[PDB]
Design an enzyme around this catalytic site. Sequence first.
Site, mmCIF file in Angstrom:
data_model
loop_
_atom_site.group_PDB
_atom_site.id
_atom_site.type_symbol
_atom_site.label_atom_id
_atom_site.label_comp_id
_atom_site.label_asym_id
_atom_site.label_seq_id
_atom_site.Cartn_x
_atom_site.Cartn_y
_atom_site.Cartn_z
ATOM 1 N N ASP A 268 4.893 -12.706 3.070
ATOM 2 C CA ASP A 268 4.993 -11.447 3.589
ATOM 3 C C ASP A 268 5.231 -11.949 5.505
ATOM 4 O OD1 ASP A 268 5.666 -9.176 4.864
ATOM 5 O OD2 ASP A 268 3.280 -8.770 5.547
ATOM 6 N N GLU B 46 -4.213 -15.087 -1.087
ATOM 7 C CA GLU B 46 -3.797 -13.773 -2.313
ATOM 8 C C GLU B 46 -3.057 -14.195 -3.801
ATOM 9 O OE1 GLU B 46 -1.514 -10.695 -0.054
ATOM 10 O OE2 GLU B 46 -2.834 -10.056 0.638
ATOM 11 N N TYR C 162 -6.257 -2.487 1.685
ATOM 12 C CA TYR C 162 -4.967 -1.928 2.880
ATOM 13 C C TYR C 162 -6.105 -0.453 2.296
ATOM 14 C CZ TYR C 162 -3.558 -5.759 5.415
ATOM 15 O OH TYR C 162 -2.406 -7.039 5.553
ATOM 16 N N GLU D 261 -8.378 -9.276 5.973
ATOM 17 C CA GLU D 261 -7.338 -8.224 6.786
ATOM 18 C C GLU D 261 -7.118 -6.918 6.356
ATOM 19 O OE1 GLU D 261 -3.619 -9.313 4.365
ATOM 20 O OE2 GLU D 261 -3.117 -11.237 5.087
#
Lengths: 620, 620
Positions: free
Chosen positions: B181, B432, B492, B527
Amino acid sequence: NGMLYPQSNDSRIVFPLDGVWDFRTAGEDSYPAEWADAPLPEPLPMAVPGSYNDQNDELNLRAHYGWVVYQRSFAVPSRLVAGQRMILRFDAATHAADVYLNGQLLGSHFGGFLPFEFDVTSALHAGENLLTVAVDNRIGSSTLPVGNDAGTAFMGSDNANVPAVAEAKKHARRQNLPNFDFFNFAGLNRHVELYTTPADAYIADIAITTERLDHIAGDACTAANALIAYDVTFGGDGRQVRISILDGEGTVVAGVTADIERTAKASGEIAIRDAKLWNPGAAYLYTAVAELLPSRIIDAYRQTFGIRTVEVSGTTFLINGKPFYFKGFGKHEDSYFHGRGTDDVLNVKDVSLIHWLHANSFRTSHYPYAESMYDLCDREGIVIIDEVPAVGMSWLQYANPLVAERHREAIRGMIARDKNHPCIVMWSIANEPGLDGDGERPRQAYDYFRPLYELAHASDPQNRPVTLVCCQNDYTTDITERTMDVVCINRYYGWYNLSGDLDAACHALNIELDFWENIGKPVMFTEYGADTIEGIHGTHGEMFSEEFQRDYYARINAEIDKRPWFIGEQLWNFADFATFQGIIRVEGNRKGILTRDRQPKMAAHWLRERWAGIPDYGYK
Amino acid sequence: NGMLYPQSNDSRIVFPLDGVWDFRTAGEDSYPAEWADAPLPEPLPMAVPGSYNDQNDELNLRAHYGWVVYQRSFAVPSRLVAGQRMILRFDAATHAADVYLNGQLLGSHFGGFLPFEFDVTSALHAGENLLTVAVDNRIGSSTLPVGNDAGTAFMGSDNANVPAVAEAKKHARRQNLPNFDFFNFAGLNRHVELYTTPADAYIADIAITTERLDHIAGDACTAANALIAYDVTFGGDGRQVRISILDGEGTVVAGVTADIERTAKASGEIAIRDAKLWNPGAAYLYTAVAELLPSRIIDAYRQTFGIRTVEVSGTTFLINGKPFYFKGFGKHEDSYFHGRGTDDVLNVKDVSLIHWLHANSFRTSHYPYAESMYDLCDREGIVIIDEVPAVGMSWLQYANPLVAERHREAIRGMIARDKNHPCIVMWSIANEPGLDGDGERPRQAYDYFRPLYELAHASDPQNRPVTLVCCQNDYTTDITERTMDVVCINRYYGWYNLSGDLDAACHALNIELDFWENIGKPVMFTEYGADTIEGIHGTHGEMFSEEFQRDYYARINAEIDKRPWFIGEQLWNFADFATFQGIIRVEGNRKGILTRDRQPKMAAHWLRERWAGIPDYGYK
């Protein structure tokens, strides 16, 4: 069946009930019955008409799930109600409502976007009356528009395979999960009024149609003769109704007296020589004055109408026999403090924006709009596609008897409400239902929709074309869209797919265009576009910039211009609007060519220049 | 193996090659190799260091697929090269380079974020030399970072079942599709320089380690004694090296003369009394000066270093034996015109912002940063977690031997470049990668990563903890993350799932924290966050508003405060940054607490206030 908008004249008076009402939130599936019997305790103010969701920043009413309760008082003089029939009209309560007057249940209604009324002749009393209106905002698998019962909202992100997430979902506060891409604004979104008709016999409905035009002028401004039909329905209980046709200066140009036959009904035809036609870009309106006779008049109703024909012929869309080209957009009823609440200041401004853009049309995505916006478009020469709230639908709904009935109600109720507007040229019976795939799914969708298509043709005395607005799908396994009278497609090549690549997007489009070229139906866009944050700029404009939105339309419009059978471009959207919150919605849907405050992004200027050079009639 | 940054002194000079080079785009899989034989024709200017993508707005270099060719000329006095070993160093050429000097192919490199060099002693000549560098930006399933060979970029939208889409994809222009990303910025991202060492014998590598600390003060500012260890490697060809330890004033506080033994190496230990320790928030740097003896000096290098120990112990992370708490964020090397190019005005400004925020740490997401940045954080007392470009991996990559070699080169190359920095407390071997799932997939991921975990432990003379930064996944079928020295999780909740629902998000979080409580490892966030457009405001903040970003951290951070084993909060991201374009990226990634221009959003003020009350040592 008839829901004539309340009128005041010598036989009839309208008492508006709009203003600042008392209001309380209530439970997820109940509200206290004693709030209809005595003033609400500790009430909040709430303006009507208006969504309630954005009218209180101390509460988080956008998150509210379930019921809320409205209330006010009103008094009327005894000499006004004496001997009259008293009707309490709710232009819209979204989605469902229970209504009480002086502690007595009048009745309930389901369907957030169409009017309902009650006879209150006997519940009314003298002095102060107490009116309570409980309003249910819940959507789900059996409501139209469709809610999701579990999971996410439409276009919502998920990590469903994460155990913590599956567990937390079981215990999350209940909320409405729209299976549609606009916020679920709720409450008394349109006006509330008490009104009066004579009690013994009254006009309950009128329908005016253009039956035939002989020798339309070359410029479509007149026809040598127009044959209109009238149909008057009466309620109550040798009787007659006089029908006078008034031109745009009020002059009587035709008039007949007709016998009322017993579902009392007067029906007939009237010839108008040298009739002045209604056109996009050049409105012209008549009035049909219906007077129920006993010199005195018992009842009266002035019905506006416009003389025009609509006909699909091969791959052309003919208004007064001329090949029309749709230039426009889907709209929303949506603004910063009103939510979905009707606002005629905005309706007026929006119509002038439509003219400023040189558009000529829009669709009522995705629910019938407030009645005054159609009156405005009749007088301003803007063409409408009128659409029911059947948005969010898939196979789960088609097998649900209660959804089918609600769907038929919305169709009948929309057409009954709106059949007299000349600006309506076409009906839409759904937005983006599931029609494609394998097995029996395409046939199951076909069999759900084909009777609704027939029902829209049979409810409309004008027999206008009927479409179904189709999502981006596998057009090769969908067997339903190709059978509509006009093919209306929503396509986002280069936005939701082939992202940012306009070359590949235009190549994909032309491949699907090559498919529709052979179907032999008129085809138009009803959605396409690109989310765009005003003030994001680039020399090589990327997704979300103003440049990319302008590049998107420039490239896509150059393709469809090569297709003689592509008869219209209605983009998505007129203006940014509120949606449920989510990772793809930057403060709502940002595909407006105008901001939510109606200011023009770069693509609006480019589109205004393109539309100023495209005529209503004869472009193809 | 060692990559000491080029240094000038009595024995060595550095000749910078930065400036405005000549430049040309070339083909998707080739460039003309005769371009190395003469000046590039019709060349563009291109500043070095810098990404090339945003240095030309006439062309669309963001869209470029393949090769570009840089070139410049340079000349130096013959009296300088005389007798010297001539090294041409590229600090970073992203992703792959072929390097030519005077038409001679010097060799090639893959690894877009680590330096590489060539002995040019024999390809130089007097007068103008012609330096030609082809840079290849392509990424795919065998690169680190990982590209996608077909389909969409990461977090890309698709309508894959539309036949027109599937067909248009076959013929779309090739573009890199990042499986990560952030935007694929390419070019001479970091400095280029020619440097000198003595030819006969020279220092080739230096590594300093803090071996043991005796009687550390209560405030950890000093220890009664520190044991450090040195390891000096030489190239070239009864010899000696003199090692001096200079304190922050330049006083020689310790020193030793060591024998060199053949691969030529000197190693030993050095005791330092009343040693002044390097801590987060209170840096202290020593200099290890290595002098190659023949009174004269043959060769010298000045190697900065700091004295501190790192140790994971149970659920605690101990720096100089004190329980440390991470406060910080992931970062990016990213800015408006430089792209990924290094910029020391920006590094200095960012470090000051880290201080302004009362943060104490960041991670080098998702590639080693420029060498200057670590020197800056050494002198400014900011802790770093150093990470290799292994981002975008799953099972497709674990069976690929070319990838596994690149992954070993990146870990060894990172640690060889960065071993000396006291600010580096921990290594990350991947960001990730796919780790969970059913069948053999978890075990396959474990078998791939465990040797890399061991390789990092064995490459680092300081033997610091190693982690792997894990994506939001099914933590019950992931069996690799829990075996890291510190558990580093990207989560998230309330953004990508349970969207907007902070109560449900905190419940889900606590369910996962209950899992990790039972595992017994120190855990921290690497994150978490929420895209946020500056200026978007609401009284009840919804996603993308500033208030929502602030509420996101307020709610989440109050949950991890209840967990004593949760040893750090590194959020995503320090600042807004560019990505491949798509429907979830509003001009790139907007989860920065600062804007792309380093301006504080509401959440940055809130976080600054929280972090000012949280001590580096002893919060938990």
